[PDB]
Design a binder for this molecule. Structure first.
Ligand SMILES: CC(=O)N[C@H]1[C@@H](O)[C@H](O)[C@@H](COP(=O)(O)O)O[C@@H]1O
Ligand SMILES: CC(=O)N[C@H]1[C@@H](O)[C@H](O)[C@@H](COP(=O)(O)O)O[C@@H]1O
Ligand SMILES: CC(=O)N[C@H]1[C@@H](O)[C@H](O)[C@@H](COP(=O)(O)O)O[C@@H]1O
Ligand SMILES: CC(=O)N[C@H]1[C@@H](O)[C@H](O)[C@@H](COP(=O)(O)O)O[C@@H]1O
Ligand code: NA
Ligand code: NA
Ligand code: NA
Ligand code: NA
Lengths: 181, 190, 187, 185
């Protein structure tokens, strides 16, 4: 079908793009930032808010003390209780959502480490501990683009893989207590 | 390149190939007319399947659809009690075994609503439902190494949405674009 | 203990003030607006978002087709699909949260009816369909106030009672269906 | 107007009952338990989940590290990461909602301290660190009852006030940081 083709092309295109963006040493660094962090936070709005919730679900099941926030007040009250043992991962596909960029800046002022995920090379000039570049959507118009989560989910999974192999014995045992009840 | 990076990327590409196989262009085209047809659309799911339900709500409301996503059983119960034949429920259960979802689809049918189930496991119990959409399985046998549980569903969501937007498009594109109108006080501008 | 007495005094004072604020005719009108509307929206942020969510829960069980939204994008996308048959209830205790005031102005431009709940009167609110005055708190310092939901819960409960007596038999049946032996998800 | 009086009587009745049920020493203890805890969890379903969400909002702004959980999957994954530095507050007005009773039991097994809030006493809550009795409602028919949050909000506000006075200076600094010139109010 012609519409079926557009969707599957958008999928393989961002697949094809994601291949070229992957910085494996950056991803293993982030996995280590998570392991070393005491408290970990995921910020995003809209569909990037859904990505942040997905991450909370998966890493909490490997034993991570974390929390997903998806609005401005939640960002403000949460950054006000961060310190140097915290890590914040911010998700913003455009790179331009002010609540996310401002909340990463607030977290940095409190000494937290910061990671921004975005499809737009940052203009902030290496302001955050890390900036993970994700695929851009192929479709030019917002209305026909595929799930905004997808560029982010790729890197979700990649970091998940690297993180699972740090201290896995302790993490597989936490994962499996769910089925064992 | 890395082995871990290697395992993740073939998980993605295998479900791209297995998805490619499972599509039924005409079933998804049908499911698209049911959303237009319904007056009230509900999306039900738990865990990661709830996140899929939340995303459908976000995308279809922006095309003008009256809809709501629910993600625990009490919301299923109270919501099904106000359904009628002009209601459509989409239920998401990758395992196909989550009782809260199967039971609330049975509940929705009782009220006369049309019903669609999304699952990686086929069955004959789902014959009760108006449609059953078959989605890709993951490939990692280890549940803990599987890639994100949303993905088999996001494919078919993207497919149905692609179809849905071409039904009565002018007015759906109007509603979508209003978020960027300069008059919209809570809009993107701000 | 004086702490204990201070908290309890806050609850008593709120209840006294609420009685002094009630306009029963207005509350009856608002009950009627809910019943007449085809779709009802509850808008709030922070503690006022929780108020909105509870109202959605209780009125859904009486058959109302309704939704609670608690952020700016939810407000914008929802107002863009409103019409003459919709009703928006906005909760802002301070009466000044811009997203809420703006969301009701956007709703009004789509033809929808609008109700603002606030503890701070204003002549700017003159533009909405109804303005419901709720109680202020009685602790001068914000950090010692009791829950910010409470002024609103009083009036939600008043509206609920008036509403339940409008075509009650049909609403009590929907509410009772949750306990029906046929109801699978139900307890 | 008989309606208006009924709703107001329900509020007054609950205030009067709440005062009779308060155990001031227990509340100070729970306030001290929250401070002493490293991580605090609030569990509730339905209206009791909104109560838990508001507790999270208010105690976080005083510097508490906490999270609210309002469904069964969330409870299990959270208990599987608890330990002795943890406190969980469980809200069940009926006292009989199984996901709440069970998961609090899981949490004690993990080493966590436990607090059930309920309006129905029971001897099989004697396994928890604390049981806070809250007020029942005063309407016979469930459909005519006031917000189900209210019995819990009374006691949450009591605990809040006790807690605010432990190390108040540092808590007021965190609370006020929301109004400092830093980004995102
Ligand atoms: C272009 C557009 O529609 N944006 C809306 C959402 O689709 C998006 O998910 C969210 C976060 O956007 P991000 O921060 O760029 O991810 O912002 C807006 O809600
Ligand atoms: C299936 C599983 O192992 N773990 C959780 C999620 O990953 C899952 O998405 C959801 C079940 O919903 P399902 O998709 O119908 O299975 O909740 C499960 O507890
Ligand atoms: C002063 C302050 O700290 N306000 C916060 C919340 O306590 C409040 O619930 C919300 C709603 O404000 P409202 O619109 O006046 O109800 O705004 C902020 O999130
Ligand atoms: C009797 C009834 O309708 N119960 C429903 C809710 O109103 C209640 O808020 C929740 C928690 O029950 P609780 O655990 O006793 O607080 O359970 C059910 O959703
Ligand atoms: Na695309
Ligand atoms: Na896979
Ligand atoms: Na007060
Ligand atoms: Na009552």
């Amino acid at each position: 079908s012609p519409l079926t083709k557009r969707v599957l092309r958008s999928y393989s295109n961002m697949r094809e793009q994601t291949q070229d963006l992957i910085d494996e040493i950056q991803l293993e660094r982030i996995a280590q930032l998570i392991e070393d962090a005491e408290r970990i936070y995921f910020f995003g709005t809209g569909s990037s808010g859904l990505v942040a919730r997905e991450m909370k679900l998966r890493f909490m099941r490997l034993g991570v003390v974390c929390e997903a926030l998806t609005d401005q007040d939640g960002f403000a009250w949460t950054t006000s209780i961060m310190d140097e043992n915290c890590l914040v991962l911010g998700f913003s596909l455009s790179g331009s959502t002010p609540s996310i960029l401002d909340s990463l800046l607030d977290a940095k002022e409190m000494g937290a480490k910061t990671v921004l995920f975005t499809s737009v090379p940052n203009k902030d000039s290496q302001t955050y501990t890390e900036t993970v570049l994700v695929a851009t959507h192929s479709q030019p118009s917002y209305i026909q683009r595929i799930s905004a989560q997808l560029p982010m989910l790729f890197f979700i999974d990649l970091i998940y893989a690297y993180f699972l192999e740090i201290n896995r014995e302790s993490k597989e045992k936490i994962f499996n207590s769910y089925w064992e009840n």
